[PDB]
Amino acid sequence: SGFRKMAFPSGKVEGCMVQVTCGTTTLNGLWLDDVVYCPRHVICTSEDMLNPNYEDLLIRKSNHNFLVQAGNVQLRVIGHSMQNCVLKLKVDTANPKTPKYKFVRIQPGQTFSVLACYNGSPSGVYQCAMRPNFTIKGSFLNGSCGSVGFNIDYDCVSFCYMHHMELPTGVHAGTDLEGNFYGPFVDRQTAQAAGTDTTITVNVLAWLYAAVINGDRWFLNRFTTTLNDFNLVAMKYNYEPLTQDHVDILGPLSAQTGIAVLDMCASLKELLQNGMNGRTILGSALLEDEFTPFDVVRQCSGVT
Amino acid sequence: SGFRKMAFPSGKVEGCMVQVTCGTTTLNGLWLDDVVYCPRHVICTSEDMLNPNYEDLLIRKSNHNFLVQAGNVQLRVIGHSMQNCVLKLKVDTANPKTPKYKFVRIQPGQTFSVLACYNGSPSGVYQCAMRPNFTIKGSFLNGSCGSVGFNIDYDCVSFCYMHHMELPTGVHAGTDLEGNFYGPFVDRQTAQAAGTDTTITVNVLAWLYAAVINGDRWFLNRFTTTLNDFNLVAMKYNYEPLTQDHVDILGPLSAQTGIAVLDMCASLKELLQNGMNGRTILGSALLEDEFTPFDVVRQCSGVT
Numbered sequence A, B: 001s002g003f004r005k006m007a008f009p010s011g012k013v014e015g016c017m018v019q020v021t022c023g024t025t026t027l028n029g030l031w032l033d034d035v036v037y038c039p040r041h042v043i044c045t046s047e048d049m050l051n052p053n054y055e056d057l058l059i060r061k062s063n064h065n066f067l068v069q070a071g072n073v074q075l076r077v078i079g080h081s082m083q084n085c086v087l088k089l090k091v092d093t094a095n096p097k098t099p100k101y102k103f104v105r106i107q108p109g110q111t112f113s114v115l116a117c118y119n120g121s122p123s124g125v126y127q128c129a130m131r132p133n134f135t136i137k138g139s140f141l142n143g144s145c146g147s148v149g150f151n152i153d154y155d156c157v158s159f160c161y162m163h164h165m166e167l168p169t170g171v172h173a174g175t176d177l178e179g180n181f182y183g184p185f186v187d188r189q190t191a192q193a194a195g196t197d198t199t200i201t202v203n204v205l206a207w208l209y210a211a212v213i214n215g216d217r218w219f220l221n222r223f224t225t226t227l228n229d230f231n232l233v234a235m236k237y238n239y240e241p242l243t244q245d246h247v248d249i250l251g252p253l254s255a256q257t258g259i260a261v262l263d264m265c266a267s268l269k270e271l272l273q274n275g276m277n278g279r280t281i282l283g284s285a286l287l288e289d290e291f292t293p294f295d296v297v298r299q300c301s302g303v304t
């Protein structure tokens, strides 16, 4: 009973967080095996960020200029390299707490947990989604860079995000663990406007299924629709177009509840056209889009 | 930038989770030092829950009937005792992962993180509040009992909740770590209706301050009110009465933003009387009450 915005247990990731300092800049690093991964803007001063030439700034840095501290003990840096927008600091000690891990590049609409950190220390964990405009709506203050996003499948941590930037609009941008930014964002203090933040339709439908499973059913109606008809409404409301791949992914939830995907699409269509009328669904007064169909199945079944 | 429903990093608590089995019932235990704490209804079969006599059911159980497994290794039970609604299983090995800890009994309106577990294994972490009717709105399926709620102050984990029951209305009830239920709930499968779920006024005001700090300011108005005037409106909307103690606790947020507590109360009064008018605050279309003023300061400052 009950449905919550749940993050993955963060222990496996907490054991990887380190502090990285270069000159006067301090941010977070991710220590896996004998490598520490961190944003390359650790080599920048606040003034360098306006127009940084990372290759030129890196020439002035040696291994001893990157101070890496894991808790209260210092790690010895024996090598450094820049891969896209991340720095890889080879250290002389493999992290004894390294979990089984993978680096994945997620698609927009996919969810992940963030372990927000400051100075190598974890402050909290929350669940968010990669928006269709490749931004995330996080909670990051100065010093949180290098905090990571991840998913966990049993004992394997799939790292998908590393925090780099706060856009002037208060939204966040970052990279995968190969240092490639999600979206068109760059690690420069310049005008970078995000595109339309459209709603993740397949996730809203997954969340409506979770609501039916947990008892909130008022929004179920006597109607059905087609993909093309639903999509005309979705376009009008800045919702992502629903495809047959999305319908297929909702198959298990449709099977468990006995509510055809297109019937749920018709419930969603009426909610878009008529609003909630002062009512709530799973404690929310708007349509939630940060639960994937996989998240709904996982939570509704008790996967550990 | 940004404000999220953030849970504490769960690592320190993950290291304490064990599985406890008695007969055919399996739930979660909390292993601290050489004691494993778990709900006493681990000794019950589903049929026993209708009218259990815990003292009588416990007489038929010996140390060897409580199977405690931490990961893949079995713990030897050398003693057992019932304290209120929890069982304390003395084991022969102190948990090497025992963090610095305290057992606290929280007040309604206070928030905490829950590490949802099944079979001694963590599934996820979320933040919730002890409701004014002493229930929590969690996400717990069968097998989640013994999952705990906690707060963390630097390196000390303050355990405040242990999950025991799902009320027929889908809300949750449990105990503190001394085994005393929050509210009037009992560990019996019987009619237990919750009282009015009133809104935690001081937390809504704290969250309005967080919204102003993060840029959402549309709801600020040209009005002020008094405690008695605000409280007439609060009564009408099932909001908890605001006291001078609540005003005092909001002092730091009032000082940081320059918005007097009574002016914020007047903004809240207009939001209650006029609604949001299709608008949102911090991504929510309703007034959020599960952030305490301490949570807002912590998140807005970067406490680790």
Ligand SMILES: Cc1ccncc1NC(=O)[C@@H](C)OC(F)F
Pocket: A041, A046, A049, A050, A140, A141, A142, A143, A144, A145, A164, A165, A166, A167, A188, A189, A190, B001
């Ligand atoms: C302040 C802040 C708050 C939260 N996240 C990141 C940042 N920091 C940045 O965006 C820096 C790295 O770039 C800036 F130079 F444009």
Ligand SMILES: Cc1ccncc1NC(=O)[C@@H](C)OC(F)F
Pocket: A001, B041, B046, B049, B050, B140, B141, B142, B143, B144, B145, B164, B165, B166, B167, B188, B189, B190
């Ligand atoms: C099913 C379930 C789901 C989530 N939490 C707890 C329970 N379980 C109970 O409430 C049991 C312990 O009492 C019942 F007998 F009244």
